[PDB]
Each structure stands twice: as C-alpha cells, then as structure tokens.
Design a protein around this ligand. Sequence first.
Ligand SMILES: [Ca+2]
Ligand code: NA
Length: 323
Amino acid sequence: GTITSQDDNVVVGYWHNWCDGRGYQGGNAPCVELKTVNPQYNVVNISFMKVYDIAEGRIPTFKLDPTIALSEAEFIAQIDTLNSQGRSVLIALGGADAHIELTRGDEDALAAEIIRLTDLYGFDGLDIDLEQAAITAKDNQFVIPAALKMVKEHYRKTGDNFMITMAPEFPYLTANGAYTPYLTELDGYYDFINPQFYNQGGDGLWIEGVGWIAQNNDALKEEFIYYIADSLINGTRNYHKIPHDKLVFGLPSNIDAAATGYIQDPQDLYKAFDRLKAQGQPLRGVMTWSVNWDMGTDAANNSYNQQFIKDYGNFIHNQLPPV
Ligand SMILES: [Ca+2]
Ligand code: NA
C-alpha cells in the first residue's frame, strides 16, 4: 500500500504482539486486533521487532504471534484500513529481552530486513525502542543509525517519507547521554521523539524556587512535565535539545502499564502543555504504553475502559497543527 506519514499532532500507542501481559498491579492486557484500536491513536507501534532466537542470527525480525488468531493477510488488511483512515503503523525495534547486539557491518542486512518487513506489512516507519542493556550494546549505536539512514534514502527515492521515531527513557537524554548518538546521527532523518517519562522512579530535575521535581511525585506532576519538556525543547539544564515540534510526551496508560509515571490528574498535563504552547513551543503530542493496557483490566477484572485516550485524545487532536 502507501507509506502513511504524519504532518500534524500525534497520539502514539504501542500494540502488543502477545496476549495477556501481566500488569505492575496484577492487571491484564489482552491481545486485540488492530481494527479494535481506538482511532484517536493515529500512530500505532507494533511491538516488537527483535531476535527471537540467537540461532537465527543477529538480525532482528518480526513474527506475528499466532495466539492473536490473525492471519498475515488480515493483519496486512487491517494496516491498510488504518492507512486509509490517515493513521500510521510503525514497527517498534527493541523492547525487553530483544537480544539486539549488532556488529559493524550488520547495517546492510538490518536495512534489508526493515525494507522487507515494511514492504510486506505496509509499515509507515520504525520506532527505536531499545531496552536499557541495548542502548550501548556492541555496535548498536553505529549500526542502527547507519541502517536507518539507508532505509530513509531508499524510500525517499520514490517520494516516500519512511517515518523514524524513538522512545528513549528520559534520563538518557542528558547532554552527552547514552542516547545522544542516536539523536545526532539521525538529526534530519527522525520525524519525532516520544521519550518514556515513566519507569524511572525518583529521577527528575532541580528547579530554583520549586525544588527537586521527581518523575514519581504526583504533587508536582505539572512542574515535572513543564520543566523536563522545557529543558529538552531548549537544550537547557543539561539536556540534549529535541525541538518542540518533534517532541511527544510518553506516558503509561494506567498504573498497570508501568511501575511509576502515570498521571493521576490529567489537568496537570493540560496545564503543562498549555504553558509550553503559550511560550511559542507547543509539543507535537503524547505517546502511551499502551493501547492494550488502555483496553485491559485491573487485578479485580475491572475494565480500564480506554481512560487514557478519553483523557488526552481530544485535547491533543483539537490543537493547531505544528510548525
Ligand atoms: Ca511527577
Ligand atoms: Na503503509
């Protein structure tokens, strides 16, 4: 089909290639068909491209989990339907226990497999979503950017914008931090970054007049969102610069989706986003782990009832487009 790229605000949601994931508070995340995903998720990230068995070699791939009971052809057709709705479907590279440890020279085969998978399934791009251990494993910092440059150029040749996004854990975005080689090598190739502002416990930043602002402090959630974003979009307070029109604020769907980082009161985000807007630096959207958790249950089997997309969908979609 058609590589479908995004020009306006985004609400990004990850999609699990597995069934019945266990939550941090004992809940459950079903596998769901793509066609079931709320349409306000206009970027949907297939999780994950990885190495399934090292006996198959170093190059990660994607294999649709048959437990999902969705044929190759049907998956393809559901991606095509999303594309017809103006929604992008990315392949997410990495995740926990991905076994991605590439050696220099592997970039050619990696690029090949990205293209093959993209052309097979009709993916619109790829999200770099490496686990902690992978960020600086072997030659990943060289190989992954090298391959992605080659993929971007491949599709630029027929007038297509293969999307590149990344999901760094935010503490790795300090100046000269471990994620910065991905950002610098792919400056001018990446479409937007959706960092994970969750699962980092008490990590945070100090601000004069406010104090220590932690990612796990619910009383200072507005100040967390505002100041971490402000630092990133300006390259201040010892953070690497990601421009506001390419920054998307990554969050847990609910308290089962991540250990920490869930926003108890959505108005803290509305307020933080509107401050960033008022200073001429509106962000590009939000991201969540995950559509499956947004559609999951708590430990007592109560539906989460799509609370994340209800809280943020309209807020984000009804903003002006980016510059
Ligand atoms: Ca906080
Ligand atoms: Na497509």
